[PDB]
Design a protein around this motif. Sequence first.
Motif, PDB file in Angstrom:
ATOM      1  N   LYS A  79     -48.387  17.327 -25.696  1.00  0.00           N
ATOM      2  CA  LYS A  79     -47.832  17.180 -27.044  1.00  0.00           C
ATOM      3  C   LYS A  79     -47.611  15.717 -27.375  1.00  0.00           C
TER       4      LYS A  79
ATOM      5  N   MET B 157     -50.451  18.741 -34.555  1.00  0.00           N
ATOM      6  CA  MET B 157     -49.818  18.039 -33.455  1.00  0.00           C
ATOM      7  C   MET B 157     -48.707  17.136 -33.969  1.00  0.00           C
TER       8      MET B 157
ATOM      9  N   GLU C 137     -45.870  19.418 -34.659  1.00  0.00           N
ATOM     10  CA  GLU C 137     -45.337  19.868 -33.380  1.00  0.00           C
ATOM     11  C   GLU C 137     -44.407  18.847 -32.711  1.00  0.00           C
ATOM     12  N   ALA C 138     -44.870  17.604 -32.599  1.00  0.00           N
ATOM     13  CA  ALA C 138     -44.070  16.564 -31.979  1.00  0.00           C
ATOM     14  C   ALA C 138     -42.793  16.394 -32.781  1.00  0.00           C
TER      15      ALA C 138
END
Lengths: 365, 364
Positions: A28, A38, A41-42
Amino acid sequence: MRVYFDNNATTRVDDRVLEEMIVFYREKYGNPNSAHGMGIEANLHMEKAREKVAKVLGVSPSEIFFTSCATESINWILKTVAETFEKRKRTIITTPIEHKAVLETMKYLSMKGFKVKYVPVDSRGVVKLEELEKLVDEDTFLVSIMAANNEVGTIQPVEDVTRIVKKKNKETLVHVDAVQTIGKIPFSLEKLEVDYASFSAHKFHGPKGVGITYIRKGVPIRPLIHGGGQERGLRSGTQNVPGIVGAARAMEIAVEELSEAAKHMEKLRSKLVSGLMNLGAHIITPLEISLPNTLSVSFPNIRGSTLQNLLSGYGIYVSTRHVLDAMGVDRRIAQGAIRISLCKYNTEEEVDYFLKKIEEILSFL
Amino acid sequence: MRVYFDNNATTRVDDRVLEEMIVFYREKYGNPNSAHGMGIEANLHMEKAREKVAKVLGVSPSEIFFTSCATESINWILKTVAETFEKRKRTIITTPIEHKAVLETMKYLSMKGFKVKYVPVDSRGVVKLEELEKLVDEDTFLVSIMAANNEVGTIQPVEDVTRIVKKKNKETLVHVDAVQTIGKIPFSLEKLEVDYASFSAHKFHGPKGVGITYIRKGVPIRPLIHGGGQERGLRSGTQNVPGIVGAARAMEIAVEELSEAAKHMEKLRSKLVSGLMNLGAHIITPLEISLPNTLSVSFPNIRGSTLQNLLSGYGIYVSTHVLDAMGVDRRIAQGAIRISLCKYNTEEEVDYFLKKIEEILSFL
């Protein structure tokens, strides 16, 4: 036998904290400011972290900011807040036992035409509340005090300092260098009534390179680092996600195990105290009002740096003034002072070793 | 909170006493043996000091001699009195619970040919009177006894002891180490019928480096320190005028406020005994016959020194052959610590001590 007794300087990362970090280095690894999957997500995990921290400190997620270390946080809060009070106020109040992160910044603000007053401390390292009430005037806009001293471990009466300050002046802001609290003594900001707090993750088994900042909703503040607009526009530059996740996880664990950890350190410390005195040591740390892991001691007839080298030769690590000076400690004692700082992972087997080896070193001398 | 509970070792000088001393350091610093004005001025004050003490102890100024400390007074008296009985008498009687000042001086005289006999003490630390009647004989020229023990606080039956010794031999001289009396228990020499008495100012808020000596008008004695002839030619050397003026003022105060001080210390002590027993402490000091400020306690499985070290870390000070002569078990003796108050300790301090000594016990 490797004996690490210098945890007030820094600590080893907790195996649990490191495992989680690795995920964001390998998988990640996205940029939390990106809008793609991504990125999204992070950003989630960065915010979960901010939340884990806010929760442990008893504050609102929006009041937590991430920096590169406690020093940066301290520079940022002192410099930019003083910056907002230019041509309006000019009095700053602090103490002579503060870490150089604070002291050196104050020296800077003085150069810039700010009035920096210093409340003295007693023989035990505790700030003198009576002098504080007096020193605080209407031109005083900020008071910077630490929660506990890193060299001797003396705990400060943050509650009192705050109360006394609000009464003498309701508009003065309070910043608390809380770097040495987490994992050693309970510290919650929920009712503390302070406006700013600084922390450093590597002091409580987190990784280096990560600082944690508390900025009460509404209080003055400005960017020390201008740029991309991260951290709500107040601290730019790509966030250190693996670092932040670890830091939050480390704080949570550190506080969760505080109780059992402190009792254990408190015990080991007592063994060191009696053993060292029997060998001729002077105890500088006021046991009744200090971090249970910190023990500053001195062998008057030996340079602390010499005792430090010898000990290091046996695989034992400890450290070795403006604080002792502020305390009125005799020059002879100061000269031979060393600091033993314990962590949750230290053991009685290790304490037995330290006592046994230092006795040898002392005999050879 | 700095809690000082070691006043049997030494004490802090009374602000009143220090105020008076300073005057003789910077203004009235003349040498008492000088004939000029400043010499006279100093001598006047030194003699008032001697008079203030005589008044307090109930004797004549001429029987008060100033020394450098109780130890010097004890060496001076035992040694010189012994000296005057060479080839005449050779027996000296004392006890096993005496302070080393006495015990070592005795060990010294033995090596020099004198016969030293030691009357035993009971389990509470009180001298055994019966055994004393038998020991005293025709060859006994001196008996040295303390008015109260410094380690456990046990008070001695001086009156009786003197009485018993007079009956067995009207010629035997009696010397009393009265160091632990002043400011704690009333002690007057007026009718006590003793020949020698030693004191140490710093045990009752006087400055260190000053000893007060009582010598009955007439009894034997010789210089331990020969020289210029000060102190009636019996103790030479320039007099510690500032020390003397202060010691006399300290003695006057300690006794003037004895009543209130002792009641206060007795109270603080009971609260301590109470709380310490509630923690498992063995009480070594015999409560019914001891100094109101002294309390020797011991814990089952904790070395006194260890307990002392931790207590010191919290800003609390206490100290750690007397116990042996009392028949106290090695186990217990090794855990014994001594709490010795003063007129200035407080209940706020007693609570802190008890509160903190409990925490300390949890880590041990």
